Amino acid sequence: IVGGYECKAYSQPHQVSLNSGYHFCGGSLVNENWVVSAAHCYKSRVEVRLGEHNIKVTEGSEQFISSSRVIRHPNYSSYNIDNDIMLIKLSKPATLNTYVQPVALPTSCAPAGTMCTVSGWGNTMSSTADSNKLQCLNIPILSYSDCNNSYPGMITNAMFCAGYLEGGKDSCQGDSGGPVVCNGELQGVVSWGYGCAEPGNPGVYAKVCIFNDWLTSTMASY
Numbered sequence: 001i002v003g004g005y006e007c008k009a010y011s012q013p014h015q016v017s018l019n020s021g022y023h024f025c026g027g028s029l030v031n032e033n034w035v036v037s038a039a040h041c042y043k044s045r046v047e048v049r050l051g052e053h054n055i056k057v058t059e060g061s062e063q064f065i066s067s068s069r070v071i072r073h074p075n076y077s078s079y080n081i082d083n084d085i086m087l088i089k090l091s092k093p094a095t096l097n098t099y100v101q102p103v104a105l106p107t108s109c110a111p112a113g114t115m116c117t118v119s120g121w122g123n124t125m126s127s128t129a130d131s132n133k134l135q136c137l138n139i140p141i142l143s144y145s146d147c148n149n150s151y152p153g154m155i156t157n158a159m160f161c162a163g164y165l166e167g168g169k170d171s172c173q174g175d176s177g178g179p180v181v182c183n184g185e186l187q188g189v190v191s192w193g194y195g196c197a198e199p200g201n202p203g204v205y206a207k208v209c210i211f212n213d214w215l216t217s218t219m220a221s222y
């Protein structure tokens with residue numbers, strides 16, 4: 001996260017770290033058994049680390065839970081990063097507590113101008129902001145017209161842009177798969193962009209609201 005601030009106590013309890021020997025992607029807990037992340041973060045098995053603030057320190061709030069299933073959206077396409085969403089089933093339920101709490105999946109799409117929060121442990125492009133301490137940033141949803149203008153022909157129904165076309169504030173490398181929360185619910189998944197925080201190159205996010213039926217029916221196959 002570039003241009004953000006260290007997240008406050010208690011504040012992003014749905015944020016998870018995906019780990020394969022190291023942090024490589026974020027994700028969001030959406031109920032006791034399931035995490036939503038980005039399909040480009042797929043690995044056949046992952047350790048989900050919940051209750052984290054500093055990913056390098058054992059704080060006593062963490063839960064480490066292996067995946068039992070990792071399910072990419074069936075229409076994920078790497079050439080264009082389309083349908084960049086994935087479900088991870090936890091091999092045992094997460095324990096919900098002060099530090100670990102799910103975020104709801106919205107059935108309605110947030111309009112242009114809505115202020116949201118993105119978070120993660122990715123690059124900060126800052127000499128004093130520590131990427132190991134979870135970072136938070138407020139970003140507004142951009143219009144479709146500005147999103148497509150930034151990346152002509154590259155924006156699909158499954159994407160939205162959010163951030164600042166002036167540059168300086170964005171998600172980055174290592175934030176992928178993590179949450180964009182708007183009015184308390186998971187509107188986006190960190191997906192792609194050209195560079196990080198560059199003028200004219202806003203962040204692109206998977207548009208969670210149009211995947212509700214895939215998400216809920218996949219999770220219901222207990």
Ligand SMILES: [Ca+2]
Nearest residue numbers: 054055057059
């Ligand atoms: Ca920790």
